[PDB]
Amino acid sequence: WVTFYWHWKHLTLWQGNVSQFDESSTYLMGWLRDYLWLNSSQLINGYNPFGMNSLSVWAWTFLFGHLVYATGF
Amino acid sequence: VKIAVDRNPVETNFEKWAKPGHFSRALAKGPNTTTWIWNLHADAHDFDNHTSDLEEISRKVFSAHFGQLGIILIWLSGMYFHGARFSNYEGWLSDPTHIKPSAQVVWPIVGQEILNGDVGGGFQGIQITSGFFQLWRASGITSELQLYSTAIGGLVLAAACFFAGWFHYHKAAPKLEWFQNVESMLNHHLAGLLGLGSLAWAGHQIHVSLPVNKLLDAGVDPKEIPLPHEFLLNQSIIADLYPSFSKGLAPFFTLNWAEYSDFLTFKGGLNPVTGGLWLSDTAHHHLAIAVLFLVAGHQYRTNWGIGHSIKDILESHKGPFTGNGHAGLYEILTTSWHAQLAINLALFGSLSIIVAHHMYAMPPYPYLATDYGTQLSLFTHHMWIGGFCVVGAGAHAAIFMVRDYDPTNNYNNLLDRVIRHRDAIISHLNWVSIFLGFHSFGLYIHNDTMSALGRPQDMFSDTAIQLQPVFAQWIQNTHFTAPQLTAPNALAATSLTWGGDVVAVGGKVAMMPIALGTSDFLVHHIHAFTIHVTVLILLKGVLFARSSRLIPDKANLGFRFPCDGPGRGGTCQVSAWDHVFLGLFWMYNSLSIVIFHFSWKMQSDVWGTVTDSGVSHITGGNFAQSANTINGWLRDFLWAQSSQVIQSYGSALSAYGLMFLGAHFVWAFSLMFLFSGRGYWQELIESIVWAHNKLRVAPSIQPRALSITQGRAVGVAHYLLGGIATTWSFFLARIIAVG
Amino acid sequence: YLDGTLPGDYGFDPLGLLDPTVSNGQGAGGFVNPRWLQYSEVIHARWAMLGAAGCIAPEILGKAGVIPAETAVDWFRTGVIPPAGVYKDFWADPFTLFFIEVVAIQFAELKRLQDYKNPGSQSRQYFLGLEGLFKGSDNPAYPGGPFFNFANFGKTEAEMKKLKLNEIKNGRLAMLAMFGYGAQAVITGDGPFDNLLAHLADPTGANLIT
Amino acid sequence: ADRPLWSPGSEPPAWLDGSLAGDYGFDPLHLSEEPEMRKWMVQAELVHCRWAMLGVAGILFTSIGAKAGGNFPDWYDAGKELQKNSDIPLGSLIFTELLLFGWVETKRLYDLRNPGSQGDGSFLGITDGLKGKENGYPGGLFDPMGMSKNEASFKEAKQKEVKNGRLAMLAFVGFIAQHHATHKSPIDNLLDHVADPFHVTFATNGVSIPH
Amino acid sequence: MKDFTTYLSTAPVVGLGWAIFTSGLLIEINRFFPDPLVFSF
Numbered sequence A: 001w002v003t004f005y006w007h008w009k010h011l012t013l014w015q016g017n018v019s020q021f022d023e024s025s026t027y028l029m030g031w032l033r034d035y036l037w038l039n040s041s042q043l044i045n046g047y048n049p050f051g052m053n054s055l056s057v058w059a060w061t062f063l064f065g066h067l068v069y070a071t072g073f
Numbered sequence B: 001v002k003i004a005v006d007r008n009p010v011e012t013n014f015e016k017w018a019k020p021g022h023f024s025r026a027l028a029k030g031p032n033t034t035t036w037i038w039n040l041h042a043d044a045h046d047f048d049n050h051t052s053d054l055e056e057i058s059r060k061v062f063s064a065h066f067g068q069l070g071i072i073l074i075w076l077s078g079m080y081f082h083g084a085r086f087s088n089y090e091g092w093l094s095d096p097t098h099i100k101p102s103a104q105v106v107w108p109i110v111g112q113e114i115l116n117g118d119v120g121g122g123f124q125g126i127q128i129t130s131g132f133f134q135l136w137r138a139s140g141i142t143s144e145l146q147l148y149s150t151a152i153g154g155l156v157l158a159a160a161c162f163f164a165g166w167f168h169y170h171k172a173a174p175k176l177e178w179f180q181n182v183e184s185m186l187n188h189h190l191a192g193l194l195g196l197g198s199l200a201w202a203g204h205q206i207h208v209s210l211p212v213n214k215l216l217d218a219g220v221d222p223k224e225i226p227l228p229h230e231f232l233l234n235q236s237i238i239a240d241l242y243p244s245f246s247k248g249l250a251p252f253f254t255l256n257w258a259e260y261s262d263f264l265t266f267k268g269g270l271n272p273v274t275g276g277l278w279l280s281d282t283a284h285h286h287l288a289i290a291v292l293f294l295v296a297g298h299q300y301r302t303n304w305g306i307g308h309s310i311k312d313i314l315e316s317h318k319g320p321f322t323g324n325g326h327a328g329l330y331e332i333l334t335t336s337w338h339a340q341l342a343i344n345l346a347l348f349g350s351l352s353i354i355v356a357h358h359m360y361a362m363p364p365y366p367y368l369a370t371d372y373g374t375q376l377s378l379f380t381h382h383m384w385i386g387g388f389c390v391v392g393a394g395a396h397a398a399i400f401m402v403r404d405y406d407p408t409n410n411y412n413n414l415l416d417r418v419i420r421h422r423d424a425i426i427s428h429l430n431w432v433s434i435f436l437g438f439h440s441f442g443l444y445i446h447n448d449t450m451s452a453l454g455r456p457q458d459m460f461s462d463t464a465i466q467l468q469p470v471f472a473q474w475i476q477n478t479h480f481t482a483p484q485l486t487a488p489n490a491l492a493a494t495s496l497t498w499g500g501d502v503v504a505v506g507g508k509v510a511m512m513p514i515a516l517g518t519s520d521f522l523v524h525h526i527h528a529f530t531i532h533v534t535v536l537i538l539l540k541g542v543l544f545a546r547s548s549r550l551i552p553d554k555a556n557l558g559f560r561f562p563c564d565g566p567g568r569g570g571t572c573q574v575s576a577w578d579h580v581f582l583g584l585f586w587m588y589n590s591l592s593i594v595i596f597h598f599s600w601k602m603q604s605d606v607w608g609t610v611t612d613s614g615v616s617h618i619t620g621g622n623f624a625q626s627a628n629t630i631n632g633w634l635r636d637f638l639w640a641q642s643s644q645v646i647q648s649y650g651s652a653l654s655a656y657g658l659m660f661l662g663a664h665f666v667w668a669f670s671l672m673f674l675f676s677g678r679g680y681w682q683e684l685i686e687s688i689v690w691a692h693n694k695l696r697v698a699p700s701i702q703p704r705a706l707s708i709t710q711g712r713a714v715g716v717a718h719y720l721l722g723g724i725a726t727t728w729s730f731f732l733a734r735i736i737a738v739g
Numbered sequence C: 001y002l003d004g005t006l007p008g009d010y011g012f013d014p015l016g017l018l019d020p021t022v023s024n025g026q027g028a029g030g031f032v033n034p035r036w037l038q039y040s041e042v043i044h045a046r047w048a049m050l051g052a053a054g055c056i057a058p059e060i061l062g063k064a065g066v067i068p069a070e071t072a073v074d075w076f077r078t079g080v081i082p083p084a085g086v087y088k089d090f091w092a093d094p095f096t097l098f099f100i101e102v103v104a105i106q107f108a109e110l111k112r113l114q115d116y117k118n119p120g121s122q123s124r125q126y127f128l129g130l131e132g133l134f135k136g137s138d139n140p141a142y143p144g145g146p147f148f149n150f151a152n153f154g155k156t157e158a159e160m161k162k163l164k165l166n167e168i169k170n171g172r173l174a175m176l177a178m179f180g181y182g183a184q185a186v187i188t189g190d191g192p193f194d195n196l197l198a199h200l201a202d203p204t205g206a207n208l209i210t
Numbered sequence D: 001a002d003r004p005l006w007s008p009g010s011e012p013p014a015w016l017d018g019s020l021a022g023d024y025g026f027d028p029l030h031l032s033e034e035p036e037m038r039k040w041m042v043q044a045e046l047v048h049c050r051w052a053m054l055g056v057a058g059i060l061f062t063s064i065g066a067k068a069g070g071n072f073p074d075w076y077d078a079g080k081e082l083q084k085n086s087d088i089p090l091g092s093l094i095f096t097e098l099l100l101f102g103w104v105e106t107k108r109l110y111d112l113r114n115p116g117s118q119g120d121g122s123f124l125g126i127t128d129g130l131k132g133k134e135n136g137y138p139g140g141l142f143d144p145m146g147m148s149k150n151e152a153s154f155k156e157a158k159q160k161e162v163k164n165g166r167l168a169m170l171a172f173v174g175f176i177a178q179h180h181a182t183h184k185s186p187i188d189n190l191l192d193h194v195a196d197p198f199h200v201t202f203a204t205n206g207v208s209i210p211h
Numbered sequence E: 001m002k003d004f005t006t007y008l009s010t011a012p013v014v015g016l017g018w019a020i021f022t023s024g025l026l027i028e029i030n031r032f033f034p035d036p037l038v039f040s041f
């Protein structure tokens, strides 16, 4: 929670739209939409039939983390 | 076979209600601990735990059956009355193509009225995905004035159903001689309840096929359509509509069935304009069902030396390997209700899932193929119900084996032979699950690795290296060439999912043939893997319930216990109850995978809108080169299709997003229970009780934490609740914004 | 196990629904038991007789020149099943007549049910001076009394049993006849007597098959 | 076997035989089974009767005045047009009503919990009066005429007010049912039925007419 | 009647009677008084 807060604060600050945070940090649908669903398009598109790029290894590791999480479960 | 009941077996009085837990003498003494309430709830229906009087148990079951059917009938009456009082059913009926079904209107209190989505028909409300308007249109309903009376009849029948339950429990409580009439129960369920009902419903569809097939599909307003009674009696009307009538009903007496071709017709398929099917096919099918189930209920000797009983048939079936088989299975069934219940639920959920598969690709209603939402809803609903029923059959098998079983009178060489190699099956299914996991799941890992390493020409693909099935394609080929080669009298194939002929109604394609490639191959292997693992869990729970390799004295510990002790390194989740616990999770996994496959296939390679030049689907065919990788399911399906559920606060679909987040919440909440124990919680309750006793406000009933079994039950309950609710919200908010 | 003492007993009960084995315990209970069943069949025979003639009396009596052809009408075209027909000019309309008959018939019935639940209980309470007429009898099917039996034939019990069996035979035959009127009025859609004239004129022509 | 019952032959309830006025053994929902609930329901029915009789009497008299020629509205929609041109505002009338009725209904209540509690002389020194003669039948001041100082006449005179009140409260349900159908006065429904019995019910909306 | 009144002290009573009273009261206060988010003063 602390890291989500810090990260999304500085993310709304770096886009020059701190008002985005000041307006969407009030409820949970914002945290789910404006932060999790939104700032991940390069994770999904790290590798695709069109062709991968430098962000492919990080996407595969992002999936590796979920695999380890599910093994923990 | 006769009737045997008793008069006033239990006097009707409100006393036994004042003492909760009377049925359990251990509970009736008093609630000295808060576990008393949870045991009251978890044992009220445990009829074989109240007492070993199987007569009283059968009476309790035969009464709870009416208790359930009363609720069923009140539910159907409530649906009909919602459709009657407040709904756009007339508006939908006058224009089914664009007007959407709505039968729930909220109250203006705190802004919830935004949920009253603008559906047209001069009325606003909540869109319903249950499928009642399309089901009612097939009955010639022209105005709202009929659903009121239909609901009245249903409610009267439900009242009479509760009356019959009370009557057969407190005034006409039967005896085990009547309950155990397997001959009568079959020949009256199979022949009467099924055959007579099917014949009645076929005769109904025969005399109601006038409005739907001809008038409703000719732009005739429902008010303009003559009422059904005006179609039934007047012979001139039914002579003008279908020339086969008014002949004199001659061909049916002398069995010269030649002139009856206008209402018992066999066509197959549907017109790309009519949207739905025809009622003549369903009428012929129901007459076939009626005749079949009516003749089948006449193959058992009951009284007049005609036929053969079940016991002789069971005795006259023996082989070289087994020898003396089927010795007491008749007693197996006639003794315990749990055996019959498990045997029923075994294939009951399977046939529910089969009904789902036969409904998604064969919509048996008018003006619903374009309704891309009702199909998904009903399909997923029936599949989850089937999964639960199968897991419940797995549970009740062990339940039977625990209480109502003894290999002395119910002895059978079949069952003991199954038991004597109860370990080779488990070991070989373990090996087969390992095979499938390394050979159905590892392929996705390989594909992700290849796509990430910068070698797209090496990844498994329908273009790089093909791995698609042919056996399913050969079945589709045998079905496609079936007309005129192996099915002469047939016109079309079994379904339009493999026969081209893209049928579209108002831009939206009502049906387009379904392809089967490497993606479907991989996903069906994943399905087989998950189903085999679930069956492994359930069967290893059922078998290792009477005895095992570790603890021989396992039957005395019962069916519902968490463990035996931390000895021999640790014993946890050893009871069949815990195996059902894990089988619920595995059934969740398997059914979820299957429903996601269904949704994404239907949205990628089936559904869409047809333009002047071909059909433009919802998605740009993203199913081909995304299913071959685990990231694809997050690349174009989960990430892409989740925009509406999180973007629906501005419309009447915000409740879907609310349920979405709440289901996530309850899921993690279940994780809480699943990962914790009782020691920590019991000591925390200890300190809280300390805090209480300082002000003298603690309760007289000893507040204890939940039982280990109840802890796991709450865990699995919240877990499946959150999971199913999140997936429901997703599949129900995504499919409304694309249809 | 059908001793034959019952008036209209002939040993016909393949279903054996009358046996004393069913309804083992004693109490109010259900309806499948001899006390209810024989009484119910006598009630059905009584109604069926009272209706079998009432379904064919106006039509036969209209073919003759005694009753006006206006009132003579088919039994199913008099107002019951108003879709088929409704006699337009009575002194009142069908719903008013139906409320009348509801009140009267349920007096008649509920005062009959109470006596079956409580034998003879209807003479106890003062009922506008008609109590001595409602005293009942040992067999509830056969109450008898001053009004109900204003003259007496069955003074001797042998003659009485003969009367009972004659009445029961006529009643069950009239029950067959009533069910004959119904299904026969469905196919032909014509009065029961006219079907007899149409048949006797050309028996094979107006038989059961074609 | 000692009194007429409602259902001839049925067994009367064991908690009421002949002590209550208008007793016929009619209680299928086991109400007023305990002594306290019966002491409550007796006086509840009594007050229902004493209001229903006055209501029906006023309604019938105003209706007869209207039909004869008097300037009298019908029983329905009479509080609407008598308030439009009245000097006493609504609300100021309602709370005056409630203020006058609370003080008397409270004294009526606490004479049920402990009879004779009101005859201690605290209210204007009234001692002999304001003492509950029985459950729901006070006296002394409410009975100026010595018409209850004889049990032989009183047990017979009180057993008929309950019947008149039951009939009056059945008539009041007739007033409501007989308005939603015809929208006419109760006396008008009578003259339109004696002059011609053919204008009986089941003719306007009593039964559904889809055919 | 007596056993019924005794039965009416369990979950099917206050816990139903309660929380029905409370849901009704809150809904009525939010209906007559449409949208409060701050006190009068």
Ligand SMILES: CC1=C(C/C=C(\C)CCC[C@H](C)CCC[C@H](C)CCCC(C)C)C(=O)c2ccccc2C1=O
Pocket (backbone or CB within 6 Å): B672, B673, B674, B676, B677, B678, B681, B705, B706, B707, B708, B710, B711, B712, E015, E019
């Ligand atoms: C929290 C927790 C508990 C404690 C569970 C508790 C305390 C459940 C109690 C909550 C209920 C809902 C209390 C509600 C009862 C109220 C006092 C009265 C009801 C309110 C009325 C209005 C109906 C376990 O027992 C447990 C067991 C095994 C693994 C994990 C856990 C675990 O995590």
Ligand SMILES: C[As](C)(=O)[O-]
Pocket (backbone or CB within 6 Å): C153, C154
């Ligand atoms: C019925 As007789 C006694 O007159 O024969």
Ligand SMILES: C[As](C)(=O)[O-]
Pocket (backbone or CB within 6 Å): C187, C188, C189
């Ligand atoms: C109604 As017909 C006489 O034509 O069977």
